């Protein structure tokens, strides 16, 4: 019940990220925004909000000023600043962050018109991001994402039946929409102690059926690119969506699926439960913990239920993995 | 209350590290504080002067090492350079 308070704090954190280049303030501001957004009360005084962890003196004084005046003088000044607003608008483009936007504003490039007029100053990734600025910012309905998941699974099985592909994230947790696709792939012949062209075959097959439209980067471990659902020859074309494909070894695949399924709060709680149960869980595998904190040989992983049973915790469906 | 600044705790830790069974008086504490401040001021001033001399705009370990070499005499300069290089290597190795 802090829609006005949380929204104004959101852009504040961005400025230390893209302009001031201070992560130590951006992380604190976003943590404060997240903890305030979960609090189901009207906020009346900053001292009352100081009880919540992650809220300090500066946040208190600023929310008090916002409650008193309806705005922040610092925020209002920085809103009308041409340089800061231009940097933020440039950083909205994928591939453009603090250094890139800072340099472009320094050389006069401040609007998307300048980006389109200066193709030579943009690399492949920056040009791809410029081309699909509007498409990338759109959300993906769950039905379209079901369709393209079916298409991806069909193509991957067409490459080889022994492949296993899992679409993790908010979709795996059952959310109605997502901002990107995280595709996780494994191969029985590819383990931690075992081909560099396994991902290449899948990428080439998806490009053949004209599903993947653009390639941002393609390596032996992870691939990032753009995909778009085909239209049925008469309707408007679907907006371009950025899809990420990652190849994981078989002994690490289920742990990677658990890590990328989410959520972040759920992952942190599971890591805390593992730590209090004498285990450490990471993106790759799970290790037992010794009495002195020394990690031993990683345990074999063959299912998510195995991971849950390792830390003596009941298996939870991805829909129940909100926290 | 005016929180005065001193190196007393670090000097005491150093003394316990090399001479575990002895103590030190308050007057000697003040003399050690003044000596540390004077040496720090000398080395920092020489490093800043060298940085201005070489048209640079940044003080790194090179200027500090050269200032130590210029200020401290032979054996002390060599040992201090060895200690500084070892400490820098250990710090960057982490």
């Amino acid at each position: 019940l802090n829609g006005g308070i949380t929204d104004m704090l959101t852009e504040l954190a961005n400025f230390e990220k893209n302009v001031s280049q201070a992560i130590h303030k951006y992380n604190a501001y976003r943590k404060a925004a997240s903890v305030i957004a979960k609090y189901p009360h009207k906020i009346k005084s900053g001292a009352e909000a100081k009880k919540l962890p992650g809220v300090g003196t500066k946040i208190a004084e600023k929310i008090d000023e916002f409650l008193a005046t309806g705005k922040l003088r610092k925020l209002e000044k920085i809103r009308q600043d041409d340089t800061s607003s231009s940097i933020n608008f440039l950083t909205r483009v994928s591939g453009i962050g603090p250094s890139a936007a800072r340099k472009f504003v320094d050389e006069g490039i401040k609007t998307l018109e300048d980006l389109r007029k200066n193709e030579d100053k943009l690399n492949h990734h920056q040009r791809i991001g410029l081309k699909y600025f509007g498409d990338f910012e759109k959300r993906i309905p769950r039905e379209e994402m079901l369709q393209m998941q079916d298409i991806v699974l069909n193509e991957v099985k067409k490459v080889d039946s022994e492949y296993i592909a899992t679409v993790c994230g908010s979709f795996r947790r059952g959310a109605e929409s997502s901002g990107d696709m995280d595709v996780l792939l494994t191969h029985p012949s590819f383990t931690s102690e075992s081909q560099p062209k396994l991902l290449h075959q899948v990428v080439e097959q998806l490009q053949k059926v004209h599903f993947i439209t653009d390639t941002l980067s393609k390596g032996e471990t992870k691939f990032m690119g753009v995909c778009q659902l085909p239209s049925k020859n008469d309707e408007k074309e679907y907006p371009h969506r950025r899809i990420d494909i990652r190849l994981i070894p078989k002994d690490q695949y289920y742990c990677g699926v658990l890590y990328f399924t989410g959520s972040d709060i759920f992952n942190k709680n599971m890591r805390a439960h593992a730590l209090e149960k004498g285990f450490t869980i990471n993106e790759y595998t799970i290790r037992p913990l010794g009495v002195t904190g020394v990690a031993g040989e990683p345990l074999p992983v063959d299912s998510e239920k195995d991971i849950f049973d390792y830390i003596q915790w009941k298996y939870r469906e991805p829909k129940d993995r909100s926290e | 209350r005016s929180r005065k600044e001193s190196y007393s705790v670090y000097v005491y830790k150093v003394l316990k590290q090399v001479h575990p069974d002895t103590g030190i008086s308050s007057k000697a504490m003040g003399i050690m504080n003044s000596f540390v401040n004077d040496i720090f001021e000398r080395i920092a001033g020489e490093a800043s002067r060298l940085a201005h001399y070489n048209k640079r705009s940044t003080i790194t370990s090179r200027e500090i090492q050269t200032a130590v070499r210029l200020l401290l005499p032979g054996e002390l300069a060599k040992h201090a350079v060895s200690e500084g290089t070892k400490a820098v290597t250990k710090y960057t190795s982490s």
Partner: protein, 105 residues
């Protein structure tokens, strides 16, 4: 490790020397490798001074460093006397030295 001093294995505060390097306006930019080197140099010099003082303190059946002991340690050594040849310490006194000419027959 958490603090910068423990990472480099020193006893002097690296961050405090860093703060003084900013405050002392020696240059508008100071690299991160300077304060650890300066702290190591200061710690080594203090260790040598204190060790020589203790080697002079212990001698007189005294287990507490006195400014007289510091003066004896500085003046007796050759390197430290050259380093601090123009420094007079309070309650330091002077080295015992009588010329052979003034000695009795």
């Amino acid at each position: 490790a958490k603090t910068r001093s423990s990472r480099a294995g020193l006893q002097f505060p690296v961050g405090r020397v860093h703060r003084l390097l900013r405050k002392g306006n020696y240059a508008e930019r100071v690299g991160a490798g300077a304060p650890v080197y300066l702290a190591a140099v200061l710690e080594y010099l203090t260790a040598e001074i204190l060790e020589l003082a203790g080697n002079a303190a212990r001698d007189n059946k005294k287990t507490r460093i006195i400014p007289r002991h510091l003066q004896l340690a500085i003046r007796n050594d050759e390197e430290l006397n050259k380093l601090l040849g123009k420094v007079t310490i309070a309650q330091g006194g002077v080295l015992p030295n009588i010329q052979a000419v003034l000695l009795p027959k």
